[PDB]
Amino acid sequence: DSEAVVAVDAVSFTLLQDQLQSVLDTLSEREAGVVRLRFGLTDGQPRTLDEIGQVYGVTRERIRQIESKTMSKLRHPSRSQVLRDYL
Amino acid sequence: GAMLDVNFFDELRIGLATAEDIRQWSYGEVKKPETINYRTLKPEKDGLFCEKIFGPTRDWECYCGKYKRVRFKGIICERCGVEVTRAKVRRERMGHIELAAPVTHIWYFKGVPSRLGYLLDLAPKDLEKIIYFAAYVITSVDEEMRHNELSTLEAEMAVERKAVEDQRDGELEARAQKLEADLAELEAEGAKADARRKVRDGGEREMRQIRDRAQRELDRLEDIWSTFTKLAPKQLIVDENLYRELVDRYGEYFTGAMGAESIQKLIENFDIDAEAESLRDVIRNGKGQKKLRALKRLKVVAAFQQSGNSPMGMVLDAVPVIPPELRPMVQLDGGRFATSDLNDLYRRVINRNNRLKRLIDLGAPEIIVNNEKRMLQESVDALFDNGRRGRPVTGPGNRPLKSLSDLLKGKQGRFRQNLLGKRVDYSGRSVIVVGPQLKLHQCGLPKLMALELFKPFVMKRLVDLNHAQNIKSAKRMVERQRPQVWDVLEEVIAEHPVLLNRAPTLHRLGIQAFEPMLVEGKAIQLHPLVCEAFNADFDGDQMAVHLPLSAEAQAEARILMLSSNNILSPASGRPLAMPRLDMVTGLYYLTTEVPGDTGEYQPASGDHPETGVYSSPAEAIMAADRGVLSVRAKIKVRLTQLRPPVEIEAELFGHSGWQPGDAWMAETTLGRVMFNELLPLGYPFVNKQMHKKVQAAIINDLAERYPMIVVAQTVDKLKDAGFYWATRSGVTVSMADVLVPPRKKEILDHYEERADKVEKQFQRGALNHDERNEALVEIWKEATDEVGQALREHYPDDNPIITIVDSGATGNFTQTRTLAGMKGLVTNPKGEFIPRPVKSSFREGLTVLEYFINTHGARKGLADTALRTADSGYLTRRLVDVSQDVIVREHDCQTERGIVVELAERAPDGTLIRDPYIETSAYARTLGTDAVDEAGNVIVERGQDLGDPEIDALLAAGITQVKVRSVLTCATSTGVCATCYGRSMATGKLVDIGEAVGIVAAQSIGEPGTQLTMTGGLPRVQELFEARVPRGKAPIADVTGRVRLEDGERFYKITIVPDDGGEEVVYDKISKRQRLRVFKRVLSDGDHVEVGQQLMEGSADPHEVLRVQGPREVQIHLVREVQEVYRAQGVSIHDKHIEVIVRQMLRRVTIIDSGSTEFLPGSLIDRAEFEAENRRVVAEGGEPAAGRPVLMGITKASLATDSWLSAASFQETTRVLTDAAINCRSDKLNGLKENVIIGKLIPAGTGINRYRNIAVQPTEEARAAA
Amino acid sequence: RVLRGSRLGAVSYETDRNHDLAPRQIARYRTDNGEEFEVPFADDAEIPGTWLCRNGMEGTLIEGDLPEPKKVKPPRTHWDMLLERRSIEELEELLKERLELIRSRRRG
Amino acid sequence: VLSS
DNA sequence: CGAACCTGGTCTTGACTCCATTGCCGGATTTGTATTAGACTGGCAGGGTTGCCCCGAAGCGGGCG
DNA sequence: CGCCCGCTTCGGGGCAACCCTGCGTCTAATACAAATCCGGCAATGGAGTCAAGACCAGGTTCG
Ligand SMILES: C/C=C/C/C=C(\C)[C@H](O)CC/C(C)=C/C=C(C)/C(O)=C1/C(=O)C=C([C@H](C)CC/C=C/NC(=O)OC)OC1=O
Ligand SMILES: [Mg+2]
Ligand SMILES: [Zn+2]
Ligand SMILES: [Zn+2]
């Protein structure tokens, strides 16, 4: 069955989720909340920029600013040596 | 019902499934035989993969795609129409097919007997015409209307017949006047009178044509009238033309249908209670074969009555559709598709259904519609059990489509074939190689293989270490095999036992659990002492490494299945870690005594001192390192570290010379000293020649008196010393050591003179062909004996070819006789001896003809070995079927009965000669009574083990009977108790309380069968357990007295002279090819016989001996008669295994008189449940059903178990399963074959609740500390 | 050598959140032979009037709409096939011929 | 299946 | 201890800019159905092997004359 | 004393189960309809996105 679980991939994916939660929670509260609500990592649905703004009461520009700042932040070899082997 | 399938199965009930349930499972009528849209490759609506019914093909995704996340689950897109949910509901859900005309499930029609045939009481070959639309059947009739109106109706029949007569005599008058005008034209003018009479004869022929037409019309009218008079349900109006002429007349007085709907109408108009009461009446009263058929119908009738079923479910109204995943349509890479071969059957049924539907809606003539309903019937029949009736439906290549009846995984057909299982993971095989440096509890193992078994373990252990950041890198690292992975692999392999199968797994030691230790190469290095258990030489045989995973699994593999804990065979308690082929020779050479050898004890003073004594084995070994002492020269050491023999111990020390640091002098070899250093300290000195029998005895003594962990270490030490001294033995086979007997020529010439004179006498005609053959055969047997004698007396005693054989290491003397000397006689391919015969030993080389004659015997041997190893498996499978549910369940039943064992019958001169076969019947048992001596003191009391010391005590006290418990008389209802089972042959202690002793007995009986060389062989054993009547049947007596013998024409004439007496038992039709029993001397007329003495030679069938002499004698006969075979082939099987088997044979009783207690006469039921029924029925009025013991063979016993879940996997899965359905027989899941199938933990070993629910908490004192 | 297949369906693997689910109504439909079947539809969705219920036959919504029962004619009758190839006068001719035929044959 |  | 200035950002406005994303409409292709008018009118699976079980003959001995 | 008449045994037949002595194309399309699709824009309207600034409000610099 080429459409079955490789069975190391599943546990690897679980570990991915766990280290991902770790690394995201290495940051502030608003940063993690923005990332999760943006990439559906808690409810499975990408919540758009304006919805993230309304759940924070700020502008779309505030949301994109925060997400872009966090994005530049995550892209470190520091924050990335742990992750990079998951792809 | 608990459909969600989680850990809770108290029962698993079957039952015939009515349409009201079949259309209740289903999630939507599939009504288009469409599989997949050829191009988009999505399921078609209403097709056999319809997502709307069976489910979504994509996790949480509708068909139109308007929903694609878990947030939308449990809901159904109102446009596409699919329950958005997980994509494995295509594995669970089912669909149905609303048929247009009902159908008969083929399992209830074509089976033999046909359950429809019984429940309707119809001839099956007249039921087939009914359901397959070949012949009508009257389904209902209005008896009262045909009764009352019959006056007028026969009135109109009479009027119609008289109209017949009016047309008849109208024709008669017409032809009469025509032929009379013919005579008036004949005589009115002159001509040849013969022409006028030809005219008369033609007129008369046409008038007899008229009377013939009238006779035929009258015949047809009478046929129709008689049929209408005798009209009643369940009649077959064959040829349909009587029916055609019939129906128009009196159609309103009855109803006649055709096909499955007609059967449905019958079963509707059918009272089961009234029918069953009719059958009860008939069985109560009617004698003869009628009672047999009435019982056979009463079976299914009471089945439907008693249960809450209804026979209406037999005619199938709506077919169900297996879930789509269990009949997938997968595509191999590259566009090809692979269907499941059920899709074609379903397409056939759906197409024929839709066509029938459109034909009916259209309005079609009766012929076409009947043809269509017949096609529908055949299609559903092919769907269920293919090619049951008819020619199986085929595809390409003329391979019959594989229908549902064949997809059942176990599905034993008439003959019991192997299961072959599941293909576990965490596995692997390889070739093995002997590992003589290992300890007993170890296994070589290729690191390149261990690194693949343990890969998850090592991944974890080297992610814990900081060698890899994640799991993923560690997986890839193992894939690359970076260097430190090996050092991790060692730590993961520490203390983690692995198993080692070896197919074929004949008996319980095929699997053992070792400690894996890494090894170079790619061969699983096996320890050499376990090859006798695995039956594994190193000719290329391959083993399989499974792996235990769970904590409990490791515990089992460590404590139960370890190697060093399994020394003794479970079959007969002999040891199998025992030394063999090499090491036996090694120790034999090490311990023998060579007089006249180097530096012996040569005591002669006056010219010098003794010069034989050595101050200790230390100095002795120093000497032997120098060239002074040989290892085997008889010497006189002064030991201080080996407990001396019994005699010298008692002499010098008295109490107990506690060995430890004493002193004493024993004259032996140094070799025996080094040997007895191998054995433990406390063990006495040996001082013998370590023959193989002696080593077996020594290891038995050890294993029965010491702990297992010492027996294992001593076996390992004996192994090491055995090899090391095997090498120094010098057992080599140079052709200058195959010494030919120097006087072979003269011996051969003598016997050739004898056989030559025999042949010349044949040429004289004095003796016929067969006579000369037998004479020559006997002469050459005599010659072979003489040659073997001369040969054995010619070889010195240290000849390698004879050292090996005498030491018991390997090979019997016949093989040395064939090396040097004579091959003797060679078998014909038929079985007879060749009168040639072979006269050259293989050292001499044969001639062409000699070798060609030898080839006969060789190839016959190999072929019979193949067939024999194939049949032994058959026997073993039957036995595991019979006794899978005989597990120890109580420490003691506390009965008082139990058989009595011979135990060294008295001698005539007056002595206790030990019975030969005591070690298997007497050893390892628990006494029922108390052995008393001299009619005095008690020598051995109730409930001891009867090992060596107490058996010896009884042979000393001089008593030769001991009533000992045995599974034949263990009273526990649910299998045996323990103490009645006695010692388990494997441990040496009392059998624990989960041992699946049934399976152990079956295995131990069917294991050595492959060695059963051979009625006198394996077929004898098999027909014994089956309990057929043997071919060489010899009648047994029925009362004592001298015999009424007679030798009639061409065979004997035997009769019994009773002593009461009475009706003398007459045995007339005997065969001259049978003989009288020579017993007590040969039988003759007028010989006083016993009660059940065997008259003729051969084998008394166990049925007759049962009927004669109770169950006791039949048990004692079966055990002894199987042991006769297994001894004849030189094999040990402790009797308790055979007893555990036979105890299954004798479970049931026949019901000759039901009394009035819910029992079918001539049927079979359990003795315990029979007793329970009578215990109940003695209250509420007595009608004690007359019961008799039945000795029923293993197969019929197995098939009539209680658990249909098990009983269906044995033989005729379909037949057993269908009538298990008709009974609606709930299973309770107490056996082993059930729990093993449904994944539930087995009720045995460590599955029982006594061990499975243990609580374990640190003792309070240790809890206080830490 | 390996040969792999694949069912024609993907395998999405989220977690089975049992709490946050889109709310959904229930519409009880009735078939013709007095069968009640229930269907969880999404909330914002026009509950369709008819439905091919689990039972296999047609299924109507429990309420009363009847926008159109059938609104469709039979496909073609044997009457159709006959009429389109003959004239009514000819059919009447053959009918009255059969009438005369049965008359003269039975009652003279 | 029947639980109990 | 204070005035002057830099600098973390923290958002917020306005300001735009591009992609999807319905929705229509218009033609392509795809899929289903109806129609063909000289006469034509019952095929080949298939067969062999095996082993087990049901019904009829036939002693045949009692019930009978 | 001879004789019938079902009871009982074995044979033969008969059949269910199994396996290999098993394992080619068929006119031709036309005509019409309805459905389903794909192809290009017009609607967008939403979703992203720059630049500037205004909140400041907490460091660092010179007085
Ligand atoms: C659901 C059951 C219905 C009745 C059973 C039927 C119709 C089967 O036809 C017979 C039972 C059976 C066979 C099923 C096989 C299945 C489910 C399957 O696929 C296997 C399989 O093929 C082999 C095994 C085990 C390895 C069999 C081990 C038997 C041990 N017996 C024993 O311990 O001696 C007392 O398990 C399975 O689940
Ligand atoms: Mg081998
Ligand atoms: Zn959908
Ligand atoms: Zn007991």
From TrEMBL, chain D:
Transmembrane segments: none
Taxonomy, superkingdom: Bacteria
Coiled-coil segments on the chain, per record: none
Function: DNA-dependent RNA polymerase catalyzes the transcription of DNA into RNA using the four ribonucleoside triphosphates as substrates.
Assembly with partners or alone: The RNAP catalytic core consists of 2 alpha, 1 beta, 1 beta' and 1 omega subunit. When a sigma factor is associated with the core the holoenzyme is formed, which can initiate transcription.
Protein family membership: Belongs to the RNA polymerase beta chain family.
Protein's name in the database: DNA-directed RNA polymerase subunit beta
Annotated organism of origin: Mycobacterium tuberculosis
Positions spanned in the full protein: 1131 to 1134 of 1172
